[PDB]
């Protein structure tokens, strides 16, 4: 079942996947649930987003140590939001190699972020220059487009059945895409395409704030961008 470790969460999505959840307490909304991804490849470790805080992303990390013991050689984070960027701090105060978006380290400041320490480009078709991302393992990081932020990027696991679509995608029961205070509801839904073109075999689609669905969270988020 579900693991925790402070005030984390861990649940085992596949034989080397884990998805970790962290709560953000908002003044006038009650408990908000931010999930990213760890992954085990042979004998390292990848993050992908950090937790709401420093504090609750060492948390991440001493889990990490505790139930795989396995150096963490790199973290990947989704964009300049508090939920994927807010324990960039602990990252970097672990030892851990840092990656975002060139877009989202320029807009850090602006966003009250701590940039990362490598940048990340992109092609015209999405996929991540290669030479930006090295030895990223099964890591295949691809920016879909502008959606829920203009800097948005999507990660998919490769030999898994797994695609994180961050902030970008929400459940297939969603009745709204969230905030839109930082959206592109131009192109909302081309970029919500792009991630599900992009990764064709992935049957399970983790997501930010909703537990990991099948692909038809993809088409449900597209048709509510297209109302945009
Ligand atoms: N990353 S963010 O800074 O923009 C953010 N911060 C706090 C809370 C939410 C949030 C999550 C779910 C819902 C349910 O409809 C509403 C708001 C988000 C959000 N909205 N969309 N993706 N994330
Ligand atoms: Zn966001």
Redesign the pocket.
């Known amino acids: 079942g579900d693991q925790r470790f402070g005030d984390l969460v861990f649940r085992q999505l596949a034989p080397n996947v884990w998805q970790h959840t962290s709560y ?1 307490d ?1 003044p006038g ?1 009650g408990a ?1 649930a ?1 999930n990213g991804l760890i992954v085990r490849d042979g004998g390292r470790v990848l993050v992908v987003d950090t937790a709401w805080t420093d504090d609750q992303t060492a948390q991440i990390l001493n889990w990490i140590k505790q139930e795989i013991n396995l150096p963490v050689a790199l973290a990947v984070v989704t ?1 300049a ?4 960027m807010g324990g960039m701090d602990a990252l970097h105060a672990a030892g851990i190699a840092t990656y975002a978006n060139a877009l989202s380290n320029q807009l850090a400041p602006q966003e009250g972020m701590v940039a990362a320490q490598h940048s990340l480009t992109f092609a015209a078709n999405g996929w991540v220059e290669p030479a930006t991302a090295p030895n990223f393992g099964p890591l295949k990081v691809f920016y879909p487009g502008p959606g ?2 203009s800097d948005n990027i999507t990660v998919g696991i490769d030999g898994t059945d797994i695609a994180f679509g ?3 995608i ?1 459940d297939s029961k ?10 592109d509801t131009e192109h909302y839904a081309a970029s919500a395409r792009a991630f599900g073109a992009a990764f064709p075999k992935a049957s399970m689609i983790v997501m ?2 909703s537990a990991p669905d099948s692909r038809a969270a993809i088409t449900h988020t597209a048709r509510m961008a297209d109302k945009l």
Do not use: E
């Not at 969603?174 to 959206?183: E, H, M, T, V």
């Open positions: 953000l908002m909304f908000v931010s964009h939001h508090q939920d994927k829920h932020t961050g902030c970008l929400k969603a009745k709204s895409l969230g905030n839109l205070g930082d959206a930010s704030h």
